Amino acid sequence: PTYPKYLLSPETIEALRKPTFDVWLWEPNEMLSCLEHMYHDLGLVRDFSINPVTLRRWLFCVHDNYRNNPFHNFRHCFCVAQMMYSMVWLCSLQEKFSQTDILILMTAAICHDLDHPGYNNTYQINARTELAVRYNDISPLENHHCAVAFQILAEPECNIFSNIPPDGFKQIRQGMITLILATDMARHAEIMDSFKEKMENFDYSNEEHMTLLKMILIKCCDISNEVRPMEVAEPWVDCLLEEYFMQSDREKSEGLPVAPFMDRDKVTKATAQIGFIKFVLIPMFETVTKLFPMVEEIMLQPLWESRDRYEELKRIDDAMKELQKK
Amino acid sequence: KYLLSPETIEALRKPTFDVWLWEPNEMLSCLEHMYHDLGLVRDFSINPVTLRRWLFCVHDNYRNNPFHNFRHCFCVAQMMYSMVWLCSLQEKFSQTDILILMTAAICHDLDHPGYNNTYQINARTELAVRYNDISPLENHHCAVAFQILAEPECNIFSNIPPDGFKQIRQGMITLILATDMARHAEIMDSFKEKMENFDYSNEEHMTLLKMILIKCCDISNEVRPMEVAEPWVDCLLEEYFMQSDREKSEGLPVAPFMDRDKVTKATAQIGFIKFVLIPMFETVTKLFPMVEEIMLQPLWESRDRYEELKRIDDAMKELQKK
Ligand SMILES: C[C@H](Nc1nc2c(cnn2C2CCCC2)c(=O)[nH]1)c1ccc(Cl)cc1
Ligand SMILES: C[C@H](Nc1nc2c(cnn2C2CCCC2)c(=O)[nH]1)c1ccc(Cl)cc1
Ligand SMILES: [Mg+2]
Ligand SMILES: [Mg+2]
Ligand SMILES: [Zn+2]
Ligand SMILES: [Zn+2]
């Protein structure tokens, strides 16, 4: 017969390994089975004795604790984890990383934005929210994401780590914390600098070198929308702006400082992306490409195409503006 | 009784102050006096009644642990006060820096549960989860401090412009977080590096001096006269033994240094005085030479007395082993 949607066709299983995967085609259950497959496929179920039913329940519980924000939602969480999965195969990460490290990368990726409220750290801090007060202005959102993740894992029925010895739990916990806290974009430049410092003489057996590489990998996945095919990447920009304009409107309304790059009166889809692609995304992937040359063809190539395309779109937007006064 | 005598006011400036004489209300008045006396009420337009309410609210949020209680909070604040005079800190620090120092000292152990970070993390408590194993207690004390200040009746900063608030908040966070002893060696290394060529106009140098200053006050019990210092040790052990009992009882790791079967009053202090307190105050003394005689002196005397007490403990134990 034809099988229900939550049983994945072998074609889907093959495509899920690539960054070309159309993340929009699927509904929550399907995305959940994809994530489930990822954990069996990467050998994590086997190597950490994860009860398969607990795995399913953990995923449903993770899903429940993402909110319906325009951008920072379950689908984002899915993109980040799916990109991480793609890079595991693209860069043959199982040759460089222990299975515990793969578990840290994957789990951190899935958990990195739990219960995101849809307003960034600058808002939390400027408006003196309960979160800012609780975290003393220190990466409040990312601390919260990480706490929710471990609240979830402390419910015994959601605890995928239940059969891991306490030495492994401690190593995994600290790994996930580092990685989730590393996604706070306030720290982008710091982390990139530390990473570039090690890249002068990179050493795969050096634990500090690897920690940074993992921090860079999760960061790559977190903001990797523009790496994806044009058709898959574009709607994410509408989602981004919808969520961010919601914040700046509120900042205006409550008399809080407003950042030009998020002002709904000043921003186009093009100006949102160009600078970000040229000066944040491209340099980051260029550096990763030095360790993993195969990344150039698969991830810098589409970033270049997207830069050029949005640069052209701006020339056109500007010419059109000029024309209404010229 | 309610009102402080001029002798009390005078004694409050010195580290000889007998912290045990006073009950909570009289300690609150002493803390009140410090804020007026330092010019903080004047220079920040603190509403005088809000100041009293704030202190009462702070008081309400300290717990009745044997050691980490409102009286410890008083000792730290009062030792800070003493150092402002001893080291003439109003010449070197802005009034904002003094306010940060005093307010952080008062707030630095708010709502302490009586079991340290190692317990929080190993037991996987609510606080360790909330703060991801990163100085959970000290983040929590800080959080509580600003929840208190968000209540408008307790807000001693209500007449400070936003920018000043932000600066005070940042300073307070750094100092309360610096009290975590897991960071002792890191902070000492950083400070000793700056003492290679210290600069009162470098903000990073001043930030570390304040971190060192609050640390000094936090752990300063042994600097006080013996009659005042000794009872704090019983409190210390009472509280730390309560933890280690619970740790044995729950299958969690127990540290020899706080094991009720292994620890005498003397073995608790000798190492701490010799390797934590003396070297820290030695470094501070290089900036403030008057510290040597007022604070390193009672420390040397304390070290020597506990070393004697240990020799006599070891002798009475030779009358026991079977
Ligand atoms: C500069 C930034 N552009 C951008 N930001 C992105 C992307 C993905 N994640 N992020 C940000 C959301 C948190 C990690 C940075 C992306 O593809 N583009 C931006 C421009 C305009 C607005 Cl309205 C919002 C963000
Ligand atoms: C080594 C430590 N000694 C010690 N620790 C002290 C003192 C003051 N504060 N503290 C600690 C309380 C947390 C900031 C350090 C003190 O006077 N002595 C200690 C030994 C045995 C037990 Cl049971 C507890 C503590
Ligand atoms: Mg995030
Ligand atoms: Mg403390
Ligand atoms: Zn994200
Ligand atoms: Zn303390």
Curated annotation (Swiss-Prot), chain A:
Domain PDEase: 1-317
Free-text cofactor note: Binds 1 Zn(2+) ion per subunit. Binds 2 divalent metal cations per subunit: site 1 preferentially binds zinc, while site 2 has a preference for magnesium. Tightly binds zinc.
Binding site for Zn(2+): 76, 112-113, 222
GO molecular function: 3',5'-cyclic-AMP phosphodiesterase activity; 3',5'-cyclic-GMP phosphodiesterase activity; 3',5'-cyclic-nucleotide phosphodiesterase activity; identical protein binding; metal ion binding
Effect of residue 72 to A: Completely abolishes catalytic activity
Outcome reported for the amino acid change (mutating residue 276 to A): Induces a dramatic change in inhibitory sensitivity by BAY-73-9961
Record comment: activity regulation: Inhibited by zaprinast; inhibitor is however not specific to PDE9A. Specifically inhibited by BAY-73-6691 (1-(2-chlorophenyl)-6-((2R)-3,3,3- trifluoro-2-methylpropyl)-1,5-dihydro-4H-pyrazolo(3,4-d)pyrimidine-4-one). BAY-73-9961 has two enantiomers, (R) and (S), due to the presence of a chiral center, and both forms vary in their pattern of interaction. Specifically inhibited by PF-4181366 (4H-Pyrazolo[3,4-d]pyrimidin-4-one, 1- cyclopentyl-1,5-dihydro-6-[(3S,4S)-4-methyl- 1-(6-quinoxalinylmethyl)-3-pyrrolidinyl]-one).
Keyword Endoplasmic reticulum annotated: yes
Pathway terms, separated by semicolons: Purine metabolism; 3',5'-cyclic GMP degradation; GMP from 3',5'-cyclic GMP: step 1/1
Binding site for Mg(2+): 113
Cofactors (names): Zn(2+); Mg(2+)
Induction of the gene: Up-regulated in left ventricular hypertrophy from aortic stenosis and following heart failure with preserved ejection fraction (at protein level).
Residues annotated as binding 3',5'-cyclic GMP: 72-76, 113, 222, 244, 272-273
Keywords: Cell membrane, Cell projection, cGMP, Cytoplasm, Endoplasmic reticulum, Golgi apparatus, Hydrolase, Magnesium, Membrane, Metal-binding, Phosphoprotein, Zinc
Family: Belongs to the cyclic nucleotide phosphodiesterase family. PDE9 subfamily.
Function noted in UniProt: Specifically hydrolyzes the second messenger cGMP, which is a key regulator of many important physiological processes. Highly specific: compared to other members of the cyclic nucleotide phosphodiesterase family, has the highest affinity and selectivity for cGMP. Specifically regulates natriuretic-peptide-dependent cGMP signaling in heart, acting as a regulator of cardiac hypertrophy in myocytes and muscle. Does not regulate nitric oxide-dependent cGMP in heart.
Protein name: High affinity cGMP-specific 3',5'-cyclic phosphodiesterase 9A
Organism of origin: Homo sapiens (Human)
Span of the entire protein shown here: 241 to 566 of 593
